[PDB]
Enzyme design. Structure first.
Site, PDB file in Angstrom:
ATOM      1  N   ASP A  29       5.498  16.921 -10.211  1.00 55.54           N
ATOM      2  CA  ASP A  29       5.042  15.839 -11.084  1.00 55.54           C
ATOM      3  C   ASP A  29       5.956  15.621 -12.278  1.00 55.54           C
ATOM      4  OD1 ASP A  29       2.898  15.841  -9.312  1.00 55.54           O
ATOM      5  OD2 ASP A  29       1.502  16.710 -10.752  1.00 55.54           O
ATOM      6  N   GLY A  67      -5.394  12.819  -8.675  1.00 49.42           N
ATOM      7  CA  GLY A  67      -4.413  13.072  -7.628  1.00 49.42           C
ATOM      8  C   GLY A  67      -3.109  12.293  -7.816  1.00 49.42           C
ATOM      9  N   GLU A 102       4.277  23.377 -20.065  1.00 51.45           N
ATOM     10  CA  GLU A 102       2.970  23.418 -19.440  1.00 51.45           C
ATOM     11  C   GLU A 102       2.696  24.803 -18.839  1.00 51.45           C
ATOM     12  OE1 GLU A 102       2.185  20.217 -16.669  1.00 51.45           O
ATOM     13  OE2 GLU A 102       0.234  20.988 -16.075  1.00 51.45           O
ATOM     14  N   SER A 108      -1.204  13.059 -13.226  1.00 49.50           N
ATOM     15  CA  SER A 108      -1.327  12.699 -14.632  1.00 49.50           C
ATOM     16  C   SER A 108      -1.112  13.865 -15.588  1.00 49.50           C
ATOM     17  CB  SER A 108      -2.634  11.945 -14.965  1.00 49.50           C
ATOM     18  OG  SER A 108      -3.750  12.818 -14.889  1.00 49.50           O
ATOM     19  N   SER A 109      -1.591  15.066 -15.263  1.00 47.94           N
ATOM     20  CA  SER A 109      -1.470  16.137 -16.268  1.00 47.94           C
ATOM     21  C   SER A 109      -0.042  16.356 -16.744  1.00 47.94           C
ATOM     22  CB  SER A 109      -2.088  17.441 -15.764  1.00 47.94           C
ATOM     23  OG  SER A 109      -3.447  17.202 -15.463  1.00 47.94           O
TER      24      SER A 109
HETATM   25 CL    CL Z   1      -2.326  15.447  -9.037  1.00 47.49          CL
HETATM   26 CL    CL Z   2      -4.108  12.542 -11.877  1.00 46.77          CL
END
Ligand code: CL
Ligand code: CL
Ligand code: CL
Ligand code: CL
Ligand code: CL
Ligand code: CL
Ligand code: CL
Ligand code: CL
Lengths: 345, 345
Positions: free
Chosen positions: B162, B114, B150, B117-118
């Protein structure tokens, strides 16, 4: 309407030299410590009160309450540090007139963590009063006062490095001499060295150490009772703190890890309970997984360990430590020392 | 002699608005996200090689090795992101000529945490190549490239926040519009507000979330299939991200916690697997212990939770969370975005 102040101070990793700051050693040969503050804090809060009382609240949530007297509070063994900081401030900056307030503390790590929390808590209580009373105390003076409050007023034996890390912040090389003379050397480490170091450090919390007071007593006895081999181990602790300091300034990671290995051996040789079979099992497993060096962060016997690992084996080391009792963390350094802010008035 | 580059990028806490960045919602109504980077990182390393090969190494230590070809690498489902970043860089900045190198990644948090990271991993791989090839890519361009690599090259569905947190760093309010148009608003939060926020936040890792892809699919379906009540829940997610942004700029903690409570209800109402009985048990226990608000940090279903707690109940909350499955941490924000450094040449 009441005033609310908070202060925080960063906890620290002992990188090298811990043990040379114990009283007999520092006074006789001179101590060296290399340490660095991390992203975990001790906190103090002062809230002024409308009732005529003084209240003290601690991290493990002990609580004491007194009415307003023009006599210093007795140090009866419950929350002596809170009471001693309060006594010093009322006597020296409020002409002995009590102040109705509540002084509370809490911390991001419990006692025995090897992160210098005990003394960091005294610093942060002092810093809250500096903010409350607008005192012109500089960093040397806050750290010296913390030292005196804990070791003289409260008669608690211990080291000399934690007061300075909590106050100053960042990466420091400290020199400890006789008659309370300390030189703090803030280290100007290159940005790539700091990033490389954080990329290569893994922290591991092994549990609460109950050996600090014993180890420090033993190290002090080494000097007082002329225990030759143990004193020589302490001389090696000192030498390697300087080598490690120089390695960091030069960005020399090979010398850094060589110095941590030699320094860890010396630290273990200086006092019997610095390590044990359990810590040694963890250390051996980390080395097996690819860590190049490591140590227990504080006096020893438990608390946080830190490992130096090349980046290509970092995840392996992280996975392995998962197999043991304790909690793995990354390592992030902070550059700032103790600071305060206001919430009401 | 080889070249060694490392890059890192900070992971993030989703404070508000997550879910409004899913494709159908952002494109139709406009999304808002409030997020902030923390003291945990994704890392990439590039090492040039003397043999004619390309090697890719991942965080859970998958490894692929290829010989030198003047054809793009196939995206066969093993390490597609590493291969796609490599393909983009060779095609666009090395005239399609392969480079013998090893591209490795690792991360301070595992998948499903959460913490974004990806996508942070894609940013950091890109940043390592920016350093290797001395590319003049600005922050908007790195974040946009990460998004395209991505979601288009690798065909992986997901959010849009992100990439921007990992690249820009700090506290950001992001506005997401149609046709990939994103506005990042770095928030100039007062120092006392930042210290007060860190003093009032407790993080709790509940375990690996396996719901992210499902929740994002459901939120997307809400808009596409005209699920009225669920769309209205998403409108509430959006509204509260703005209220929370304003609360932080104004240093208004009462409004901050009111907005987190309303926003948590909306997030749970937007997709079925955002919360579950286990997460709800933890949440209820935290509230019982004195926490005033909280939420799951990413899409939901597990990973990190964050709690807002007044300082006088912080240790109580910390003690209580110890009774549940998971790991408690403090919250320390970082101001810097992705950065790179060199180790050899
Ligand atoms: Cl996430
Ligand atoms: Cl994560
Ligand atoms: Cl130490
Ligand atoms: Cl040390
Ligand atoms: Cl400690
Ligand atoms: Cl300690
Ligand atoms: Cl989120
Ligand atoms: Cl969110």
């Amino acid at each position: 309407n009441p005033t609310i102040i908070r202060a925080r101070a960063p906890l620290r990793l002992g990188l090298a030299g811990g043990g040379t700051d114990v009283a007999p050693y520092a006074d006789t040969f001179g101590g060296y410590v290399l340490n660095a503050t991390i992203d975990r804090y001790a906190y103090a809060v002062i809230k002024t009160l409308t009732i005529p009382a003084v209240r003290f609240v601690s991290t493990d949530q002990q609580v004491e309450k007194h009415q307003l007297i023009s006599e210093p509070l007795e140090l009866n063994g419950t929350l002596n540090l809170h009471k001693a900081v309060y006594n010093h401030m009322i006597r020296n900056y409020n002409h002995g007139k009590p102040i109705a307030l509540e002084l509370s503390t809490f911390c991001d790590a419990p006692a025995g963590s090897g992160l210098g929390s005990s003394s960091t808590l005294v610093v942060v209580m002092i810093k809250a009063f500096v903010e409350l009373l607008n005192l012109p105390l500089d960093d040397y003076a806050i750290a010296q006062l913390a030292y005196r409050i804990e070791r003289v007023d409260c008669g608690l034996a211990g080291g000399r490095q934690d007061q300075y890390s909590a106050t100053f912040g960042g990466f420091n090389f400290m020199e400890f001499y006789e008659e309370e003379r300390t030189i703090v050397n803030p280290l100007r480490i290159k940005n790539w060295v700091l990033c490389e170091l954080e990329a290569s450090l893994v922290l591991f919390y092994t549990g609460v150490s109950r050996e600090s007071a014993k180890i420090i007593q033993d190290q002090s006895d080494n000097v007082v009772s002329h225990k030759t081999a143990a004193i020589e181990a302490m001389h090696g602790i000192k030498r390697e703190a300087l080598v490690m300091k120089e390695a960091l300034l030069k960005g020399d990671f090979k010398a850094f890890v060589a110095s941590m290995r030699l320094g860890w051996d010396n630290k273990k040789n200086s006092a019997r309970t610095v390590s044990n079979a359990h810590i040694d099992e963890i250390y051996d497993a980390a080395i097996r997984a690819g860590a190049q060096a490591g140590k227990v962060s504080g006096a020893g016997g438990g608390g946080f360990m830190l490992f130096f690992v090349p980046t290509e084996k970092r995840m392996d080391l992280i996975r392995t430590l998962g197999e043991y009792d304790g909690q793995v963390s990354n390592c992030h350094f902070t550059k700032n020392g103790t600071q305060a802010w206001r919430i009401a008035n």
